Design a protein around this motif. Structure first.
Motif, PDB file in Angstrom:
ATOM      1  N   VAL B   5       0.811  -1.039   0.187  1.00 10.46           N
ATOM      2  CA  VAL B   5       0.100   0.318  -0.040  1.00 10.46           C
ATOM      3  C   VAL B   5       0.188   1.131  -0.017  1.00 10.46           C
ATOM      4  N   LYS B   6       0.683   2.020  -0.803  1.00 10.47           N
ATOM      5  CA  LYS B   6       1.677   3.752  -0.592  1.00 10.47           C
ATOM      6  C   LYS B   6       0.453   4.982  -0.804  1.00 10.47           C
ATOM      7  N   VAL B   7       0.571   5.764   0.053  1.00 11.32           N
ATOM      8  CA  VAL B   7      -0.512   6.547   0.091  1.00 11.32           C
ATOM      9  C   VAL B   7       0.718   7.886   0.308  1.00 11.32           C
ATOM     10  N   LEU B   8      -0.603   9.287   0.075  1.00 18.31           N
ATOM     11  CA  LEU B   8       0.401  10.361  -0.453  1.00 18.31           C
ATOM     12  C   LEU B   8      -0.522  10.924  -0.641  1.00 18.31           C
ATOM     13  N   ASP B   9       0.441  12.827   0.545  1.00 16.49           N
ATOM     14  CA  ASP B   9      -0.587  13.534   0.807  1.00 16.49           C
ATOM     15  C   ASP B   9      -0.572  14.725  -0.202  1.00 16.49           C
ATOM     16  N   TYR B  96       0.275  -6.423  -5.962  1.00 16.33           N
ATOM     17  CA  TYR B  96      -1.331  -5.452  -5.960  1.00 16.33           C
ATOM     18  C   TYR B  96      -0.586  -5.074  -5.087  1.00 16.33           C
ATOM     19  N   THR B  97      -0.593  -3.246  -6.361  1.00 18.17           N
ATOM     20  CA  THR B  97      -0.357  -1.733  -5.889  1.00 18.17           C
ATOM     21  C   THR B  97      -1.546  -0.773  -5.065  1.00 18.17           C
ATOM     22  N   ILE B  98      -1.913  -1.220  -3.609  1.00 19.33           N
ATOM     23  CA  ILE B  98      -2.833   0.163  -3.382  1.00 19.33           C
ATOM     24  C   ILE B  98      -2.415   1.521  -3.295  1.00 19.33           C
ATOM     25  N   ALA B 100      -3.103   5.599  -2.581  1.00 19.87           N
ATOM     26  CA  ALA B 100      -4.372   6.307  -2.084  1.00 19.87           C
ATOM     27  C   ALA B 100      -3.507   7.760  -2.047  1.00 19.87           C
ATOM     28  N   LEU B 101      -4.534   8.910  -2.279  1.00 22.34           N
ATOM     29  CA  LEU B 101      -4.154   9.639  -2.198  1.00 22.34           C
ATOM     30  C   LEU B 101      -4.999  10.994  -1.529  1.00 22.34           C
ATOM     31  N   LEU B 102      -4.257  11.960  -0.613  1.00 24.16           N
ATOM     32  CA  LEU B 102      -4.573  11.807   0.815  1.00 24.16           C
ATOM     33  C   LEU B 102      -5.273  13.898   0.172  1.00 24.16           C
ATOM     34  N   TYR B 107     -10.085  11.857  -1.035  1.00 21.88           N
ATOM     35  CA  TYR B 107      -9.519  10.994  -1.674  1.00 21.88           C
ATOM     36  C   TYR B 107      -9.488  10.269  -2.632  1.00 21.88           C
ATOM     37  N   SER B 108      -9.024  10.108  -3.756  1.00 24.74           N
ATOM     38  CA  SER B 108      -8.512   8.460  -4.711  1.00 24.74           C
ATOM     39  C   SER B 108      -7.912   7.453  -3.848  1.00 24.74           C
ATOM     40  N   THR B 109      -7.670   6.559  -4.745  1.00 22.82           N
ATOM     41  CA  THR B 109      -7.651   5.527  -4.807  1.00 22.82           C
ATOM     42  C   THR B 109      -7.549   4.711  -6.340  1.00 22.82           C
ATOM     43  N   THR B 110      -6.550   4.014  -6.432  1.00 24.35           N
ATOM     44  CA  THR B 110      -6.448   3.353  -7.672  1.00 24.35           C
ATOM     45  C   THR B 110      -5.386   2.189  -7.367  1.00 24.35           C
ATOM     46  N   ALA B 111      -5.781   0.840  -8.124  1.00 26.02           N
ATOM     47  CA  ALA B 111      -4.935  -0.025  -8.153  1.00 26.02           C
ATOM     48  C   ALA B 111      -4.039  -0.365  -8.967  1.00 26.02           C
TER      49      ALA B 111
ATOM     50  N   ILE C  98       6.675  13.327 -10.695  1.00 24.81           N
ATOM     51  CA  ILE C  98       5.063  14.422 -11.229  1.00 24.81           C
ATOM     52  C   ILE C  98       4.549  12.335 -11.454  1.00 24.81           C
ATOM     53  N   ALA C  99       2.858  12.442 -10.736  1.00 28.12           N
ATOM     54  CA  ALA C  99       2.713  11.287 -11.291  1.00 28.12           C
ATOM     55  C   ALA C  99       0.872  11.494 -11.895  1.00 28.12           C
ATOM     56  N   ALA C 100       0.615  11.131 -12.770  1.00 20.03           N
ATOM     57  CA  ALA C 100      -0.832  10.768 -13.787  1.00 20.03           C
ATOM     58  C   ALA C 100      -1.436   9.550 -13.950  1.00 20.03           C
ATOM     59  N   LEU C 101      -2.570   9.490 -13.151  1.00 19.94           N
ATOM     60  CA  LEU C 101      -3.017   8.536 -13.288  1.00 19.94           C
ATOM     61  C   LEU C 101      -4.488   9.096 -14.171  1.00 19.94           C
ATOM     62  N   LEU C 102      -4.321   8.428 -15.501  1.00 15.42           N
ATOM     63  CA  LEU C 102      -5.396   8.503 -16.755  1.00 15.42           C
ATOM     64  C   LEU C 102      -7.032   7.475 -16.884  1.00 15.42           C
ATOM     65  N   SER C 108      -5.836  12.761 -13.150  1.00 10.49           N
ATOM     66  CA  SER C 108      -5.465  13.254 -12.192  1.00 10.49           C
ATOM     67  C   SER C 108      -3.759  13.289 -11.732  1.00 10.49           C
ATOM     68  N   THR C 109      -3.291  14.416 -11.276  1.00  9.61           N
ATOM     69  CA  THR C 109      -1.583  14.354 -11.357  1.00  9.61           C
ATOM     70  C   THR C 109      -1.624  15.047  -9.894  1.00  9.61           C
ATOM     71  N   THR C 110      -0.529  14.479  -9.486  1.00  8.19           N
ATOM     72  CA  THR C 110       0.447  15.178  -8.184  1.00  8.19           C
ATOM     73  C   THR C 110       1.891  14.918  -8.678  1.00  8.19           C
TER      74      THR C 110
HETATM   75  C1  LIG Z   1       2.983   3.827  -7.072  1.00  6.34           C
HETATM   76  C2  LIG Z   1       3.032   4.892  -7.209  1.00  6.34           C
HETATM   77  O1  LIG Z   1       1.494   5.493  -7.200  1.00  6.34           O
HETATM   78  C3  LIG Z   1       2.044   7.197  -7.377  1.00  6.34           C
HETATM   79  O2  LIG Z   1       2.872   7.383  -7.390  1.00  6.34           O
HETATM   80  C4  LIG Z   1       0.421   7.752  -7.443  1.00  6.34           C
HETATM   81  C5  LIG Z   1      -0.371   7.184  -7.938  1.00  6.34           C
HETATM   82  C6  LIG Z   1      -2.144   8.399  -7.331  1.00  6.34           C
HETATM   83  C7  LIG Z   1      -2.955   7.420  -7.713  1.00  6.34           C
HETATM   84  C8  LIG Z   1      -4.072   8.562  -8.110  1.00  6.34           C
HETATM   85  C9  LIG Z   1      -3.888   9.547  -8.208  1.00  6.34           C
HETATM   86  O3  LIG Z   1      -4.833  10.459  -8.322  1.00  6.34           O
HETATM   87  C10 LIG Z   1      -2.473   9.917  -8.444  1.00  6.34           C
HETATM   88  O4  LIG Z   1      -2.430  11.400  -9.108  1.00  6.34           O
HETATM   89  C11 LIG Z   1      -1.775   9.246  -8.614  1.00  6.34           C
END
Ligand SMILES: CCOC(=O)/C=C/c1ccc(O)c(O)c1
Ligand SMILES: CCOC(=O)/C=C/c1ccc(O)c(O)c1
Ligand SMILES: [Ca+2]
Ligand SMILES: [Ca+2]
Lengths: 116, 115, 115, 116
Positions: B5-9, B96-98, B100-102, B107-111, C98-102, C108-110
């Motif tokens: 799991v990876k979480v970003l601020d 699996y990498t989960i 989360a961006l907080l 919040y947004s989460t992706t796998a 710079i991360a982008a989720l498409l 979304s980008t962070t």
């Molecule tokens: C596995 C590394 O994940 C990232 O560095 C960033 C993931 C991420 C997830 C959701 C987002 O909206 C985003 O901009 C980025």
């Protein structure tokens, strides 16, 4: 309308229509009790879940059935559902808009809280 | 490492460090059995939650304590926590990498599922 | 590696591979001078864009060709590309991710900025 | 109203109010030409940017001045602005809603496209 939920589809650039959701409220014994439910309309919105009188202080959970949504489009998604858990009305009555943006392997959710 | 799991601020543009989380596995009576837990590292990552022998097909819930994270920063958050609920499915070879961006009210989460 | 870009695919839950991008630096006449470019790897990452000597303060634009990526997958996208425009600022010791989720109709980008 | 932009603040859980934005259209010589501009209202919405007659086929860019927004709240953000570039009306007239969700180091943007 102190609680409205809006669901969007990020794959099709459309509202997410006919998405089921259930709302629960945490009881004093720490269990989740059924509070309200419904499906999004053509605009991807669900209105009229509750009233000001009924929507008291508490911890609420909105479970959005994203999995059934993607399935009916032929997609096998990652998540079982999207969950949004939050304390409501802690400082007095507020209006809550919960927005959810859906992709098969991702979702985001945001709240807009305005003072009545 | 079948699950990480990876979480970003999103407010400070950094990893979310020392975020606590619990992973649950759905039981046949439809209740959540604790399975694994930990705190994110300085890179905002939580590794070594489970092993591939232990990580069998089923429904899993990751419950991330986002509220305590924002409280420690002095910022009033909307969510009690962030929940990611998914089915683990053999495909076969998969990690699996989960992520989360907080934010305080979002919040947004992706796998990311790879081989 | 003062600057790295990571791109993820929200439709398939994987790294976004072979995504092309260009990095521009704002010039004093307010036009964009090409600076660096490349394609994401199998991990969806683009490394080695610049060096810390070269990466001086200023305004930068990363232009990610998301449209060609979705076209190759047979999916009709909304955006022409994804643009991330930011100021690089000495702080001092800092690395930028710079991360982008498409998704086809969303992105979304962070930025993760560390030391 | 074939083009509307909606901006939300993910830090405060509110609409993003008084956010400036400029819209540009790509000319035949590949330059960006000024098309329309405005600021979001109290609901975080900007309406009336253009008309059906004026909003012809083309490539459009919406530049949302997110940096000034965060500055006036005391925050030094990452991005200079949020940019949304897209081809419009390629298969005939559509209505476009561009939504943007803002954090100091992150933003997301989605489009809802509906057939008039
Ligand atoms: C596995 C590394 O994940 C990232 O560095 C960033 C993931 C991420 C997830 C959701 C987002 O909206 C985003 O901009 C980025
Ligand atoms: C017209 C859509 O109104 C909204 O509330 C959109 C919210 C929204 C939610 C999540 C996102 O990632 C986003 O870009 C936008
Ligand atoms: Ca309503
Ligand atoms: Ca309108």
């Amino acid at each position: 309308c102190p609680l409205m939920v809006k669901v969007l589809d990020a794959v099709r650039g459309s509202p997410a229509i006919n998405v089921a959701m259930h709302v629960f409220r945490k009881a004093a014994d720490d269990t989740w009790e059924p509070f309200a439910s419904g499906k999004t309309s053509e605009s991807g919105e669900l209105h009229g879940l509750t009233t000001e009188e009924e929507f008291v202080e508490g911890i609420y959970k909105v479970e959005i059935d994203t999995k059934s949504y993607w399935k009916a489009l032929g997609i096998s998604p990652f998540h079982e559902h999207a969950e949004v858990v939050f304390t409501a009305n802690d400082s007095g009555p507020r209006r809550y808009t919960i927005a959810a943006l859906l992709s098969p392997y991702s979702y985001s959710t945001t709240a807009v809280v305005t003072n009545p």
